[PDB]
Amino acid sequence: VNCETSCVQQPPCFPLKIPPNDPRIKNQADCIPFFRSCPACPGSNITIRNQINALTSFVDASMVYGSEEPLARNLRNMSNQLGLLAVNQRFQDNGRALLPFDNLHDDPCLLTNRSARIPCFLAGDTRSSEMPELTSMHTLLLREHNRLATELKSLNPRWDGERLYQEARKIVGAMVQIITYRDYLPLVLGPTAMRKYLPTYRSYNDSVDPRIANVFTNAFRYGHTLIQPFMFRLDNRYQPMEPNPRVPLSRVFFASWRVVLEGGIDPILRGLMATPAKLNRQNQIAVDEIRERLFEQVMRIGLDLPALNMQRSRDHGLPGYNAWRRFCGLPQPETVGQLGTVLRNLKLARKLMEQYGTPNNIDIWMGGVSEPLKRKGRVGPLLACIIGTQFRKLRDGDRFWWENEGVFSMQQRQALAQISLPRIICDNTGITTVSKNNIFMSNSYPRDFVNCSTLPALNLASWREA
Amino acid sequence: CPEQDKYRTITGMCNNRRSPTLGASNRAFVRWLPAEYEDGFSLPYGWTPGVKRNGFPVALARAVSNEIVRFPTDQLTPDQERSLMFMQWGQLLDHDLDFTPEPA
Numbered sequence: 077v078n079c080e081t082s083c084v085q086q087p088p089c090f091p092l093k094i095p096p097n098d099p100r101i102k103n104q105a106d107c108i109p110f111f112r113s114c115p116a117c118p119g120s121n122i123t124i125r126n127q128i129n130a131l132t133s134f135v136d137a138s139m140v141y142g143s144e145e146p147l148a149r150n151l152r153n154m155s156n157q158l159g160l161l162a163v164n165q166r167f168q169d170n171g172r173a174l175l176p177f178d179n180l181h182d183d184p185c186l187l188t189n190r191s192a193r194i195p196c197f198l199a200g201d202t203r204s205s206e207m208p209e210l211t212s213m214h215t216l217l218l219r220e221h222n223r224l225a226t227e228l229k230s231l232n233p234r235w236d237g238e239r240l241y242q243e244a245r246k247i248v249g250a251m252v253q254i255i256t257y258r259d260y261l262p263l264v265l266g267p268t269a270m271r272k273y274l275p276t277y278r279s280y281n282d283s284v285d286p287r288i289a290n291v292f293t294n295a296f297r298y299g300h301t302l303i304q305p306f307m308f309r310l311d312n313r314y315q316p317m318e319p320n321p322r323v324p325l326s327r328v329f330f331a332s333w334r335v336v337l338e339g340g341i342d343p344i345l346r347g348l349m350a351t352p353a354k355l356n357r358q359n360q361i362a363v364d365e366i367r368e369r370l371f372e373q374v375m376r377i378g379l380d381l382p383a384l385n386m387q388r389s390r391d392h393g394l395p396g397y398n399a400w401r402r403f404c405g406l407p408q409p410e411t412v413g414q415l416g417t418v419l420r421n422l423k424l425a426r427k428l429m430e431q432y433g434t435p436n437n438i439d440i441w442m443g444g445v446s447e448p449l450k451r452k453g454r455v456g457p458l459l460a461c462i463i464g465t466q467f468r469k470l471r472d473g474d475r476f477w478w479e480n481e482g483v484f485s486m487q488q489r490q491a492l493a494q495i496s497l498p499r500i501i502c503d504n505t506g507i508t509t510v511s512k513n514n515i516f517m518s519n520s521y522p523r524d525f526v527n528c529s530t531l532p533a534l535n536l537a538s539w540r541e542a
Numbered sequence: 543c544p545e546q547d548k549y550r551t552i553t554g555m556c557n558n559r560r561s562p563t564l565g566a567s568n569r570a571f572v573r574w575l576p577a578e579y580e581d582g583f584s585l586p587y588g589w590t591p592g593v594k595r596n597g598f599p600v601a602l603a604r605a606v607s608n609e610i611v612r613f614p615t616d617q618l619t620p621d622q623e624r625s626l627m628f629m630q631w632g633q634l635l636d637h638d639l640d641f642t643p644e645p646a
């Protein structure tokens with residue numbers, strides 16, 4: 077039973093049924109395709125079905141380096157003792173490195189433009205090509221590895237290939253941890269939930285379970301509410317890059333050819349920095365570029381990402397809204413009126429009640445994103461508890477956390493405290509004007525922007541052994 | 543696990559020395575609440591026609607999306623206090639944390 081072409085409900089498929097008067101799909105014999113997640117124990121009549129995490133739960137830049145041994149060695153340049161990641165062998169972005177090409181059997185990136193013949197990129201995670209903005213972030217971190225490896229080879233001539241790669245990998249991972257917990261998370265959670273769920277780091281506790289919880293794979297999809305219906309590219313004066321400044325998202329999905337043959341990563345990074353996020357509002361949850369036309373170029377029908385989210389939660393056997401509220405120690409509304417108070421929105425509580433019958437049944441992503449946002453945060457109380465709890469676990473339960481004693485020297489921690497995403501963008505692109513920190517708040521050029529000369533470079537002096 | 547190691551393993555194995563697969567790749571998710579399946583152990587809610595969840599009909603995911611999520615794009619609110627880079631770092635970070643396999 078091919079889930080992509082068939083609408084039959086048999087394993088491993090769980091197609092999404094289409095209601096009457098759907099605004100796009102007029103035939104109710106049609107479906108949105110859906111493959112059930114792989115079970116941790118297939119065919120068992122003992123275990124309660126659980127799903128697999130193919131990646132390392134740790135904030136360790138596994139999207140750059142990979143989570144499995146054969147991938148990880150194949151991502152490395154084994155042609156010298158310079159400790160580098162492998163780079164594209166056919167293309168360069170105005171003389172700067174791109175990701176290598178992958179060799180898949182049914183490569184979707186080829187389907188996005190049959191004329192360009194540009195395949196998907198090979199990185200540590202399989203989704204690197206999903207949108208060119210993501211590809212740009214992956215390419216950036218590939219370059220930073222390669223830059224740090226080069227300086228380490230000059231600072232320490234005795235260091236071999238393996239030493240150079242590992243030391244450069246350790247730094248990159250700490251940079252992801254610093255940007256995430258210092259810059260990103262306070263803006264997700266807001267100060268009241270940051271203080272409550274992520275109090276000041278003490279040290280490594282080997283009794284804190286660092287696994288990703290099944291609910292997190294769905295809750296953290298809150299991000300789908302932040303998605304703008306275009307990819308925005310800007311030239312060196314931050315002004316629209318013609319002839320296509322705003323490409324609709326449904327024509328960028330797996331459009332790896334746009335990085336390769338339409339300007340590189342510079343115009344994409346500038347657009348990320350100088351375009352606002354979409355704001356999540358209770359009557360403006362998610363755009364039709366992802367609700368109607370997700371992956372339209374690469375398959376027979378356009379997907380519905382929010383609907384896929386709700387289907388996935390059921391597939392994963394995730395309890396509903398009230399059960400998660402109770403987990404988080406938050407009151408659990410039972411009537412439309414109580415749901416109305418909790419949402420501060422009776423109109424939305426009524427829609428949710430007509431759909432779900434009871435707030436007990438509201439699917440977690442839907443309940444989660446429906447809640448009013450915390451002050452200075454971008455999630456409601458439920459999501460802030462779930463995301464917060466996961467991140468505190470990932471920090472307190474990681475023996476290689478950057479602040480944990482012995483991972484770095486005292487002088488190395490002091491230098492790493494100076495890093496920033498703007499400075500990494502400076503050091504690895506042709507971009508000379510970047511966002512003032514915090515890069516995740518700054519969105520308006522020229523007002524929120526500064527010269528790369530004003531930002532201090534990371535000091536690798538404390539990595540010299542001499 | 544080795545007694546000493548300066549760097550992470552690629553799989554995440556040995557980060558926790560008492561339970562060395564915690565946070566390692568290709569392992570089951572931890573559950574913070576027991577699973578809720580239509581038959582109690584494997585079939586998802588909405589799988590079988592007429593089988594209710596907590597005594598109410600299961601709502602089609604596509605119908606909830608049509609009724610609550612759908613909005614005209616011309617109403618879109620730009621976030622004055624967040625860049626699109628805030629969206630993109632979230633995705634990138636998600637990609638450092640989890641990927642739930644499905645059969646090909």
Ligand SMILES: *[C@@H]1O[C@H](CO[C@@H]2O[C@@H](C)[C@@H](O)[C@@H](O)[C@@H]2O)[C@@H](O[C@@H]2O[C@H](CO)[C@@H](O[C@@H]3O[C@H](CO[C@H]4O[C@H](CO)[C@@H](O)[C@H](O)[C@@H]4O)[C@@H](O[C@H]4O[C@H](CO)[C@@H](O)[C@H](O)[C@@H]4O)[C@H](O)[C@@H]3O)[C@H](O)[C@H]2NC(C)=O)[C@H](O)[C@H]1NC(C)=O
Pocket residue numbers: 281282283284468469472
């Ligand atoms: C290293 O980390 C450990 C884990 O810390 C947790 O996760 C972190 C992310 C952070 O959020 C912490 O706040 C978390 O607690 C931590 O060890 C935990 O320590 C707590 C407090 O001692 C333990 O909690 C106790 O558990 C018992 C037993 O019941 C629990 O388990 C059952 C079955 O799952 C549940 O039904 C219960 O609800 C509990 O979850 C409780 O018993 C009694 O304790 C009190 C008086 O003695 C009283 O207040 C209570 O009313 C009750 O009668 C107890 O209350 C509390 O819930 C927890 O189980 C520990 N976890 C582990 C994995 O061992 C370490 O302390 C931390 N070390 C340092 C130095 O920081």
Ligand code: HEM
Pocket residue numbers: 206207292293294296297298299300302303366381384385388629630632633636640641642643
């Ligand atoms: C260009 C933007 C994005 C696209 C096109 C996209 C697309 C997808 C798709 C297709 C899925 C799987 C749907 C399913 O079958 O269940 C998915 C899952 C997910 N997404 Fe998004 N996504 C985007 C942005 C984001 C953002 C910004 C965040 C976080 C702030 C995010 C977090 C997640 C998480 C955690 C998963 C589950 C991952 C897994 O365990 O496999 N997404 N998304």
Ligand SMILES: O=C(NO)c1cnc(NCc2cc(C(F)(F)F)cc(C(F)(F)F)c2)[nH]c1=O
Pocket residue numbers: 184202203204206371374633636
């Ligand atoms: O970007 C994502 N999250 O942030 C994301 C995208 N796609 C899937 N799964 C569906 C998928 C994945 C891939 C993958 F994993 F290879 F990129 C390829 C396709 C297809 F069929 F469109 F080519 C679909 N899961 C995800 O988490």
Ligand SMILES: *[C@@H]1O[C@H](CO)[C@@H](O)[C@H](O)[C@H]1NC(C)=O
Pocket residue numbers: 153155156160161162163164165
């Ligand atoms: C390996 O490194 C050398 C030196 O920078 C470079 O010229 C070559 O293209 C690299 N090979 C790969 C596969 O990255």
Ligand SMILES: *[C@@H]1O[C@H](CO)[C@@H](O)[C@H](O)[C@H]1NC(C)=O
Pocket residue numbers: 189191192333337
């Ligand atoms: C496909 O790529 C080519 C360059 O190979 C480009 O000129 C053409 O516009 C692309 N197709 C579309 C629809 O943009």
Ligand SMILES: [Ca+2]
Pocket residue numbers: 131132133134135136137138139638639
């Ligand atoms: Ca990881």
Ligand SMILES: [Cl-]
Pocket residue numbers: 289290291292572573574575
């Ligand atoms: Cl869970």
